[PDB]
Amino acid sequence: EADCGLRPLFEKKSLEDKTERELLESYI
Amino acid sequence: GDFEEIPEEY
Amino acid sequence: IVEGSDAEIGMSPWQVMLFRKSPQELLCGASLISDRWVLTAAHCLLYPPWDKNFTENDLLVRIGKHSRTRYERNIEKISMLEKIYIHPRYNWRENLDRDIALMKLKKPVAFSDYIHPVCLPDRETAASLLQAGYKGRVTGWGNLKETGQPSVLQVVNLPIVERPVCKDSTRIRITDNMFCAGYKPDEGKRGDACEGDSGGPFVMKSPFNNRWYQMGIVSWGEGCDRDGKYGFYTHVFRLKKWIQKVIDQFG
Ligand SMILES: N[C@H](Cc1ccccc1)C(=O)N1CCC[C@H]1C(=O)NCc1cccc(Cl)c1
Numbered sequence: 340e341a342d343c344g345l346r347p348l349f350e351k352k353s354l355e356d357k358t359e360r361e362l363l364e365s366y367i
Numbered sequence: 368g369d370f371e372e373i374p375e376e377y
Numbered sequence: 378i379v380e381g382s383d384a385e386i387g388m389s390p391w392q393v394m395l396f397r398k399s400p401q402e403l404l405c406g407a408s409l410i411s412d413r414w415v416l417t418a419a420h421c422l423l424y425p426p427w428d429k430n431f432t433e434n435d436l437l438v439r440i441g442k443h444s445r446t447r448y449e450r451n452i453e454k455i456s457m458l459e460k461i462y463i464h465p466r467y468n469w470r471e472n473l474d475r476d477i478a479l480m481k482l483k484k485p486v487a488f489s490d491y492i493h494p495v496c497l498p499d500r501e502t503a504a505s506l507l508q509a510g511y512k513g514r515v516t517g518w519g520n521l522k523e524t525g526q527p528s529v530l531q532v533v534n535l536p537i538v539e540r541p542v543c544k545d546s547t548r549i550r551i552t553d554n555m556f557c558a559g560y561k562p563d564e565g566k567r568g569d570a571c572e573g574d575s576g577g578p579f580v581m582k583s584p585f586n587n588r589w590y591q592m593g594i595v596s597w598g599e600g601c602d603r604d605g606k607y608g609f610y611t612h613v614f615r616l617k618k619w620i621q622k623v624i625d626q627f628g
């Protein structure tokens with residue numbers, strides 16, 4: 340989809356889940 | 368078994 | 378999933394449960410990739426050493442779920458299979474090379490707060506994200522240890538491991554169509570997929586466009602969460618050509 344991978348209860352509302360920052364921090 | 372039964376329709 | 382945590386509501390809205398019609402039980406995990414296509418592991422459907430060979434009418438897809446066992450009225454949606462497509466060069470005889478399959482649904486599923494598809498990587502997102510040390514996330518309703526069952530969907534974040542470490546951890550022949558993930562014994566942290574988590578997604582959130590991509594499929598491991606061992610995942614991007622051919626021909 341054009342909207343794939345954007346979760347209604349998180350990205351679509353600019354809310355983060357409790358552990359996605361662990362992934363971000365691993366991405367250099 | 369351990370699973371709640373589903374609606375017969377499926 | 379072992380050493381993971383309960384998922385949040387709507388955390389993995391592409392999560393799919395493959396469910397056996399009789400006896401009624403969890404068969405595998407899977408993922409939603411469009412309103413009528415579901416991706417899983419081939420070994421979920423075809424694995425002759427264990428006398429496994431499922432047909433379309435043997436299974437259902439349960440989408441939107443959180444609880445493992447409960448029927449989640451007004452939230453989950455339950456779908457019938459139109460057709461199963463297994464990779465024609467899936468290697469069930471030796472090492473589960475090309476462990477991938479597609480399932481087309483009889484009717485489109487309605488998206489909702491709890492039901493939404495994941496993205497599949499393009500070559501550039503794959504080259505950027507599939508790097509040793511970068512973490513992904515694996516989700517499933519499978520066993521909590523090697524040998525309880527969870528009440529709800531479990532989640533664990535795991536780092537991609539360098540190919541020589543993957544190769545040196547096992548006597549099985551590893552291919553470019555796999556990658557491995559997990560912590561090393563000295564890293565402290567642990568966690569892994571386990572039985573029942575087969576076919577579920579390994580996802581990453583792209584820091585470039587902030588979308589979730591499914592990079593891997595839960596494929597195989599020697600035991601679960603053992604020190605010095607790693608879980609192995611189907612490399613989705615490497616099999617992209619096959620996925621598009623199927624979707625483009627059978628729509
Ligand atoms: N334990 C076997 C090892 C094996 C690998 C390649 C080919 C033959 C056997 C395995 O994982 N199997 C036997 C066939 C199904 C798969 C499995 O249980 N996968 C589930 C699993 C468990 C732990 C970690 C992961 Cl990533 C996946």
Ligand code: NA
Pocket residue numbers: 544545546547548549
């Ligand atoms: Na080896």
Ligand code: NA
Pocket residue numbers: 559560569602603604605606607608
């Ligand atoms: Na391990």
